[PDB]
Amino acid sequence: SIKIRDFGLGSDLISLTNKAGVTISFTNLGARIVDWQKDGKHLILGFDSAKEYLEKDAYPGATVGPTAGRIKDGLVKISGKDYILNQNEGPQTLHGGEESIHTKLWTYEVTDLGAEVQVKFSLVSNDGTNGYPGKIEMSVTHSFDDDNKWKIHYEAISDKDTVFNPTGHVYFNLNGDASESVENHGLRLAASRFVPLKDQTEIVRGDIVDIKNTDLDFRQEKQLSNAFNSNMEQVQLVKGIDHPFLLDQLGLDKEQARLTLDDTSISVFTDQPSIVIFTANFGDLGTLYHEKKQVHHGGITFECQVSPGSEQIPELGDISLKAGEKYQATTIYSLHTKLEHHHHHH
Amino acid sequence: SIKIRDFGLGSDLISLTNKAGVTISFTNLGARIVDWQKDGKHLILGFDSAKEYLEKDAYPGATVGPTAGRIKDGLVKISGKDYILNQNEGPQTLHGGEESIHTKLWTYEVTDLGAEVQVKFSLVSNDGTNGYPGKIEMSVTHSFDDDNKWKIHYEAISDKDTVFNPTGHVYFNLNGDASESVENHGLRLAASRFVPLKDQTEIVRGDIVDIKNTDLDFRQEKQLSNAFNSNMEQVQLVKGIDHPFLLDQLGLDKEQARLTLDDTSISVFTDQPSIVIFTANFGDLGTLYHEKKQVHHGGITFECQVSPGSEQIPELGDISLKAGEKYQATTIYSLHTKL
Numbered sequence A: 001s002i003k004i005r006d007f008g009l010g011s012d013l014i015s016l017t018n019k020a021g022v023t024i025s026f027t028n029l030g031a032r033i034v035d036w037q038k039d040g041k042h043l044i045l046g047f048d049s050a051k052e053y054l055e056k057d058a059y060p061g062a063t064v065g066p067t068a069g070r071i072k073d074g075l076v077k078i079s080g081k082d083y084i085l086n087q088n089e090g091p092q093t094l095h096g097g098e099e100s101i102h103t104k105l106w107t108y109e110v111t112d113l114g115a116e117v118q119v120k121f122s123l124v125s126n127d128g129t130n131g132y133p134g135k136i137e138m139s140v141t142h143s144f145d146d147d148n149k150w151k152i153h154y155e156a157i158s159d160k161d162t163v164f165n166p167t168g169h170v171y172f173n174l175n176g177d178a179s180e181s182v183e184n185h186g187l188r189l190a191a192s193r194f195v196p197l198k199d200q201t202e203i204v205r206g207d208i209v210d211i212k213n214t215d216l217d218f219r220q221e222k223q224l225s226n227a228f229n230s231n232m233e234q235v236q237l238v239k240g241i242d243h244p245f246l247l248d249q250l251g252l253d254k255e256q257a258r259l260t261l262d263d264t265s266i267s268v269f270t271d272q273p274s275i276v277i278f279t280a281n282f283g284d285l286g287t288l289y290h291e292k293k294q295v296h297h298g299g300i301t302f303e304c305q306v307s308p309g310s311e312q313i314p315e316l317g318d319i320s321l322k323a324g325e326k327y328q329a330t331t332i333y334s335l336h337t338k339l340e341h342h343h344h345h346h
Numbered sequence B: 001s002i003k004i005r006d007f008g009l010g011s012d013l014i015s016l017t018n019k020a021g022v023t024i025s026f027t028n029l030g031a032r033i034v035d036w037q038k039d040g041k042h043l044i045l046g047f048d049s050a051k052e053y054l055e056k057d058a059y060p061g062a063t064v065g066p067t068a069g070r071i072k073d074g075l076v077k078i079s080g081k082d083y084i085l086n087q088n089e090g091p092q093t094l095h096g097g098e099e100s101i102h103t104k105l106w107t108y109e110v111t112d113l114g115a116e117v118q119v120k121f122s123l124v125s126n127d128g129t130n131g132y133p134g135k136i137e138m139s140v141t142h143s144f145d146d147d148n149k150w151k152i153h154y155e156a157i158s159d160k161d162t163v164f165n166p167t168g169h170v171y172f173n174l175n176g177d178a179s180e181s182v183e184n185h186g187l188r189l190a191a192s193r194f195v196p197l198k199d200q201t202e203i204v205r206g207d208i209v210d211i212k213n214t215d216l217d218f219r220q221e222k223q224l225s226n227a228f229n230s231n232m233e234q235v236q237l238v239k240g241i242d243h244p245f246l247l248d249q250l251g252l253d254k255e256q257a258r259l260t261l262d263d264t265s266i267s268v269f270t271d272q273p274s275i276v277i278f279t280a281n282f283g284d285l286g287t288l289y290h291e292k293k294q295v296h297h298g299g300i301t302f303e304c305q306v307s308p309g310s311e312q313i314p315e316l317g318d319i320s321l322k323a324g325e326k327y328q329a330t331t332i333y334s335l336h337t338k339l
């Protein structure tokens, strides 16, 4: 079943329920996921109206770009030319600049396929918007099926050589309450290396470090508290995790990550090379989610994309997009029950 | 009463009916007027869904900008510096460039004041969008009241010196049917001069011309067919009217123009210095409105703004917007029915 209603300020809320009774909902403001529930419990963080996003925090669950992450000094090199993008975090360009795509109302069309329902959102980034050559015709399709898979498919074409590396910014919290830390969740992540940050500004340090056998090694499932309690420099720097992890094996076919709490697991699949994980290191900010004050570590993202810092570490990849060339990315979050035995106490 | 409904592609249709039973409707797609009707008759041109505007013609009823009109070679000088804007009509920048603000979904808020209802649309034009310095935070408030007055109030603030001169692009047709020419309407217009066009590219010619006592003099009510059957080179050039008229007296209290058909009249009020009038000179294009094929001259606009061409004829005015300055503009369309 598909239901639509106004969500505030002119945005709409699109709610889908699959054959299993799982419901998930999106909004065209930022081509964003708003909620995902199983048996009455929220699996992610979200607000109850469009205004909350604009007033409290506009990133949760949004589509961010054109480039996700921080670009040191807003500087990119496109076809031998240097371009300076909007700088909204000190001299850095963070998540595409100020008032980026996550803040716009995208147009959308819903396609009902029976076992799968697709919500395709569209937006055009005009040439020069925030410094980015364009125009860029973008589209994000969010779909949910009877197998409990929520898939995100990105597509884009530019009139000019530009850069493109968007991501989905959902925050999960299997406690179903923002005021509860995700330290009690188990995390499995197929990555042997990470990208350290230079300092508090969060630009990349310049090197790639192996994390096997450290507190950031999650190849084998472990509680998130292990990282949070860590005194490793990088953890202390950000007060949790806020880094890109380099996937060891690429391919949409492999389970790159798995987040579990009791009988519920979320599996992550993607065709991208890294996953930036940020664990809501907000301290005492206490943003209210459904009237609950969010706690430090009250959520975790899995931003699949090309790792930020490629400007400094070419080995990370190349996010350039040639004129006329079609960009595509696919990321999938799948819900499972009793995938494994996870019985712990904090 | 207020009624909000889905208009397609995620856009909304907001309809307002006043004490008089008159209905006016808008959509957030392009902060635009979609319909305006009395006793079941359409007063303006409009489509039935968002899709139509995108596939047929995105201008009707829209808020166009940041700069309305044509800019020669897409070139503007800002703080002594040359800036090239998006060129979407040959080398000109027309109505702000491609995929401009008329094609975007604006956010909005409705405010019910009882005798008056306001719909405030907002949008941010990022710095650099289509070549324009910014960011520009814009708001367009469309309001309707029990006196049958449809008002448009614009406001904007820019982070950087830029240019700004938007307009409302509603097309009127008192016939209530696009397949019928507006040649039968009578027009009055308080303007003694106009801005001639250079040629078919529609860029300005360079001069300002007195129209007193010509086929374009409407200081005294006259029927459109007059102008339409004129042999004035400028009329022949565009096959109708597609020109900026300079208002003789500025100020919002003065009725600047009046469009009449029988018992029904539309008065125009504005704080802008000029009115661009375009008589839907589409030839055989035949765009479909409500299933009716549009005819050449099947509509007329009253685009109030600073006249286009100021880049070549400074006397016309200056559309610059300095950083931090608040831009404001107001245009009113008032409906009257003779009893």
Ligand SMILES: C[C@H]1O[C@H](O)[C@H](O)[C@@H](O)[C@H]1O
Pocket (backbone or CB within 6 Å): A059, A069, A094, A202, A242, A243, A276, A277, A278, A301, A303
């Ligand atoms: C909003 C968040 O988005 C990402 O996860 C960044 O890496 C974090 O530092 C923060 O900017």
Ligand SMILES: C[C@H]1O[C@H](O)[C@H](O)[C@@H](O)[C@H]1O
Pocket (backbone or CB within 6 Å): B059, B202, B242, B243, B276, B277, B278, B301, B303
């Ligand atoms: C869409 C129309 O908008 C204005 O009225 C212009 O002057 C006309 O030439 C046409 O471009």
Ligand code: NA
Pocket (backbone or CB within 6 Å): A005, A006, A010, A011, A012, B005, B006, B010, B011, B012
């Ligand atoms: Na809606």
